[PDB]
């Protein structure tokens, strides 16, 4: 029993974190085989962050301008290249701790674990969701750039996020591991706005199923709804539309609990319209939207890696 | 910016988890140097869990009755002993991944990270607090016994919890790494009640300071209070009394924010009496009590390990 915001064990990623220094600037990099991946703006100086020309900046660098440190062992850079907003530094040593891994670009609404790092040293691990507006509500300070987000599947680390930026609202933006930003953001020192965000409906439903599996049923009701009528309510409350694909993905939780998806939708409609009336669900007084259906099955069933 | 329930990186603990089997029963153990630590009720059979005599059960076991598996390498047990509610199995191989470590018994109100494990394999990591009634609100299923809780200080893992039991209310109970239960619990297959719980006042105050550091100030007010008057309110709302020691420990956060501790106490009093009125603090509609003052400083300042 119980239900927590649970991250993946971070050990396989910890062994990949290094520190990359170019001139005055230091941030984190990810060392996999004989390549170190980091945000390309490690090459920027103080007073052209407003709109740097990165190709023009990189052609002026040499390998010896990049200091890469793993623990306190220096790794010699023997090549460099830029892929989108990520710098790839070829080093003379393959990381002996390289796990099985893949790079994946996730969809909004998917969750991942973040290993927050400073100076190449891990600080903590927490779970995040990619918001519908392609930001994450992380916890990151100066020096955290190049920290990564990941999921683990059996033995395999799927890296999905590298940290680049904090927006004026306090939320965070970054790229996939091939250096493409999530969202419309760009890597320059400018105030950038995210689109308006919405609540991840399929995840709220998954968490309601988690509450039922764990013995909370006070919010259930005898009603059902159609997908169309539910989506008219979702829109009023700034919830994402629920698709038949979402309904299908919720199938397993529906089967385990005996509660049809559209019956749970009627519970959510009543919660949106009436609130909780001083009650809580899984220890929360708000409707939680950062657990996917897979996260619920993993934690209520106990999958390991 | 941002503030998350952040766990310690788990890699140093992952490398210590093993699987211990005695007859039909399998649970997790912790392999440090040449000793494996696990809950002693690994030696119980189905139908004397009601009140087993563990000394009488252990004298009937031999080393070859204990199967210890690290990954899929079997470790030969060469000695065994019982310390309180923990079994210590001496094995023929020292764990080459043993981190610097200590065993510590924590006070209620302190937090720690849990590495939930099944069959010796880590599943996830999350942050917990030891409640005032000596339970934890964990997330644990059948097979999770022997999972451990820990803190990390620079290079050193301080192990503080080993998992043993789920109470009828769905909360969890266990021991220190020397096998002494937190709370009044015993290791038998019986329904046991925890004392009534209370809210960890000093931690709520720390989290209010975290909110201020991160730019939330709506709950502040122009008032102060005396420690005595505040504690009369705390008691009415089932909050733990705030001591001068707590006030002193909050000193650093008070200095960084410019808000005297007793001024923050007046904010908390108003929140207890009036509620939040539809507003949130750090993304929560409830007052959060599972961050210590140290947790706040660590995360708002960025300490690494
Ligand atoms: C990240 O650690 C980096 N720092 C540096 C420093 C020098 C060169 C390159 C980099 S990357 C840093 C992470 C931030 C810091 C605070 N909380 C975080 O998550 N990222 C940045 O500082 C980033 C660098 C850009 C070149 C991408 N800039 C911003 O996040 C940023 C800049 C502004 C801003 O400029 C006028 C206005 C408003 C908001 C804002 N965010
Ligand atoms: C833990 O994984 C163990 N399982 C076994 C199985 C065989 C021998 C030894 C052990 S330890 C298990 C963790 C539980 C399971 C569900 N969620 C958890 O956290 N711990 C137990 O199962 C534990 C064993 C005791 C010997 C300590 N028993 C309980 O947690 C328990 C027993 C009761 C109960 O019995 C009548 C009534 C109400 C509640 C309850 N909890």
From Swiss-Prot, chains A, B:
Q: Which reaction does it catalyse?
A: TSAVLQ-|-SGFRK-NH2 and SGVTFQ-|-GKFKK the two peptides corresponding to the two self-cleavage sites of the SARS 3C-like proteinase are the two most reactive peptide substrates. The enzyme exhibits a strong preference for substrates containing Gln at P1 position and Leu at P2 position
> Source species, please?
Severe acute respiratory syndrome coronavirus 2
What is the official name of this protein in its record?
3C-like proteinase nsp5
Localisation per UniProt entry? Host cytoplasm; Host Golgi apparatus; Host nucleus
Positions bearing the Glycyl lysine isopeptide (Lys-Gly) (interchain with G-Cter in ubiquitin) cross-link: 5, 90
Q: How does it assemble?
A: 3CL-PRO exists as monomer and homodimer. Only the homodimer shows catalytic activity. Interacts with host FBXO22; this interaction promotes the proteasomal degradation of nsp5.
Cytoplasmic side, ranges = 1-305
Q: Which residues of the full protein are shown?
A: 3264 to 3568 of 7096
- The record places the active site at 41 (for 3cl-pro activity), 145 (nucleophile)
Peptidase C30 domain residues are 1-305
Please describe, based on the UniProt annotation, the reported consequence of changing residue 49 to A.
Does not affect ability to cleave and inactivate human TRMT1
The protein's role, per its UniProt record: Cleaves the C-terminus of replicase polyprotein at 11 sites. Recognizes substrates containing the core sequence [ILMVF]-Q-|-[SGACN]. Cleaves and inactivates human TRMT1, preventing tRNA guanine(26)-dimethylation of tRNAs. May cleave human NLRP1 in lung epithelial cells, thereby activating the NLRP1 inflammasome pathway. May cleave human GSDMD, triggering alternative GSDME-mediated epithelial cell death upon activation of the NLRP1 inflammasome, which may enhance the release interleukins 1B, 6, 16 and 18. Also able to bind an ADP-ribose-1''-phosphate (ADRP).
Activity regulation, per record: Inhibited by pyridone-containing alpha-ketoamides compounds 13a and 13b. In turn, alpha-ketoamide 13b (tert-butyl (1-((S)-1-(((S)-4-(benzylamino)-3,4-dioxo-1-((S)-2-oxopyrrolidin-3-yl)butan-2-yl)amino)-3-cyclopropyl-1-oxopropan-2-yl)-2-oxo-1,2-dihydropyridin-3-yl)carbamate) inhibits SARS-CoV-2 replication in human lung cells. Inhibited ex vivo by michael acceptor inhibitor N3. Inhibited ex vivo by compound 11a and 11b.
């Amino acid at each position: 029993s119980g239900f927590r915001k649970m991250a993946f064990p971070s050990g396989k990623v910890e062994g990949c974190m290094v520190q990359v220094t170019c001139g005055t600037t230091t941030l984190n990099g990810l060392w996999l085989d004989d390549v170190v991946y980091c945000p390309r703006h490690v090459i920027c100086t103080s007073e052209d962050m407003l709109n740097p020309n990165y190709e023009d900046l990189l052609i002026r660098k040499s390998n010896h301008n990049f200091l890469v440190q793993a623990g306190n062992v220096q790794l010699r850079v023997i090549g460099h290249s830029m892929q989108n907003c990520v710098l790839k530094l070829k080093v003379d040593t393959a990381n002996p701790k390289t796990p099985k891994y893949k790079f994946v670009r996730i969809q909004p609404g998917q969750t991942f674990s973040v290993l927050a790092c400073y100076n190449g040293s891990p600080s903590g691990v927490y779970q995040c969701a990619m918001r519908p507006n392609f930001t994450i509500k992380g916890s990151f300070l100066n020096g955290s750039c190049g920290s990564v987000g990941f999921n683990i599947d059996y033995d395999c680390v799927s890296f999905c996020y590298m940290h680049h930026m904090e927006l004026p609202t306090g939320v965070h933006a970054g790229t996939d591991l091939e250096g493409n930003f999530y969202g419309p953001f760009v890597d320059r020192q400018t105030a950038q706005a995210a689109g308006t965000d919405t609540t991840i409906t399929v995840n709220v439903l998954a968490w309601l199923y988690a509450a039922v599996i764990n013995g909370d049923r006070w919010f259930l009701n005898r009603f059902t709804t159609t997908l169309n009528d539910f989506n008219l309510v979702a829109m009023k409350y700034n919830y994402e539309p629920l698709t038949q694909d979402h309904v299908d993905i919720l199938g397993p939780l529906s089967a385990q609990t005996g509660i049809a998806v559209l019956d749970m939708c009627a519970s959510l409609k009543e919660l949106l319209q009436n609130g909780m009336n001083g009650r809580t669900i899984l220890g929360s007084a708000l409707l939680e939207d950062e657990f996917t259906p897979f996260d619920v099955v993993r934690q209520c069933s106990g999958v390991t890696f």
